[PDB]
Amino acid sequence: FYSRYSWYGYSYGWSR
Amino acid sequence: NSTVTRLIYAFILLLSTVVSYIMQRKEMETYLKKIVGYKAVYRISFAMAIFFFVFSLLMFKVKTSKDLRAAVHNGFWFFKIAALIGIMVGSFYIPGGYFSSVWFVVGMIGAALFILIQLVLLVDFAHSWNESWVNRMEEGNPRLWYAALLSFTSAFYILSIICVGLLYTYYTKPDGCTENKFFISINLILCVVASIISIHPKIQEHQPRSGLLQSSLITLYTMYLTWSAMSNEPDRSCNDSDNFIGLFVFVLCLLYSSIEKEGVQYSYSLFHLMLCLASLYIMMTLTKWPAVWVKISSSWVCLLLYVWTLVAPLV
């Protein structure tokens, strides 16, 4: 998945 | 049932703390003198400390509920209370004077240790919270959890900003209280730096779920600490709500800590040691330069510990 360095951490929920 | 026992122990500590608070009032000086308020508070705090230390040493290396000592931990609340009363009376039997300063220094060291341990626990709790909520963000409805995370982090940061505003209004003057300005400015700048470090992509690469939420929580805790350091400043130019808020945060941490044949859910000995250190810290708080310097160094150790927990993976 396109995990990204979002402010809330290192996730991919916003860009699943 | 183990969680219930931990919560009940927290309850007995809270009851003892409330008793200490109530005897602190001026009206009670009349009753206690008939046998000052800080002396009785010291006595009851010594009772707490000695009882919890005794139980913790009793609970050493206990590893299964099959231990009769495990039952002793679980049951005999009434005998626990009775032994506590007997001890507290015994404390009244110790002479006053040098004992006062000896217990004061013992309480200072205990409060320092409790602050350190509670702070490690707070960082762990914040990390676990952030990880659980990002996981629920990924698996379930992203929008709900995103909104929740944003609301919580924004709330903590706004509360810290409000605390900064109040501290600037009260404990600082345009051309006075330079120590207050120094402390507040250093704490705010270091909190901002800690927040920035919590977003650096390289840091997150090693800790994928380390985000702004735990940063804001640490910032709020640091703001509370620094405020508390100022409220006790002997110099009135540079000088109960802060202690109430500290008690609330301590209660939150104790609840987090609170929340069998093959293995125990938690080491009863270490939990009771933490409880004893909590008794010492409350004893110190409810009441001098050492208090101020200890609190300020505690805030700085807060920020250093958070930065270290974030950076150590880098090393």
Residue numbers in the entry:
A (entry chain L): 102 to 117
B (entry chain A): 34 to 68, 93 to 296, 334 to 353, 397 to 424, 439 to 466
What did the paper state?
The host proteins SERINC3 and SERINC5 are HIV-1 restriction factors that reduce infectivity when incorporated into the viral envelope. Here, we determine cryoEM maps of full-length human SERINC3 and an ICL4 deletion construct, which reveal that hSERINC3 is comprised of two α-helical bundles connected by a ~ 40-residue, highly tilted, “crossmember” helix. Thus, we conclude that hSERINC3 is a non-ATP-dependent, nonspecific lipid transporter for PC, PE, and PS.
We tested a variety of recombinant systems, and the protein yield was highest for human SERINC3 expressed in Sf9 insect cells. The average resolution of the WT hSERINC3 map was 4.2 Å. The structure of WT hSERINC3 is comprised of two α-helical bundles connected by a ~40-residue, highly-tilted, “crossmember” α-helix (H4). The two bundles are connected by a long 40-residue, diagonal “crossmember” α-helix (H4). The map in the region of the Fab-distal α-helical bundle (H1,2,3,9) has a lower resolution (~4.4 Å) due to conformational variability between the domains. Interestingly, the density for the H8 helix was ill-defined in the WT hSERINC3 cryoEM map, whereas H8 was well-defined in the ΔICL4 map and in TMS1d17 (d asterisk). The cryoEM maps of hSERINC3 show that the helical bundles may move as rigid bodies with a pivot point in the center of the crossmember helix H4.
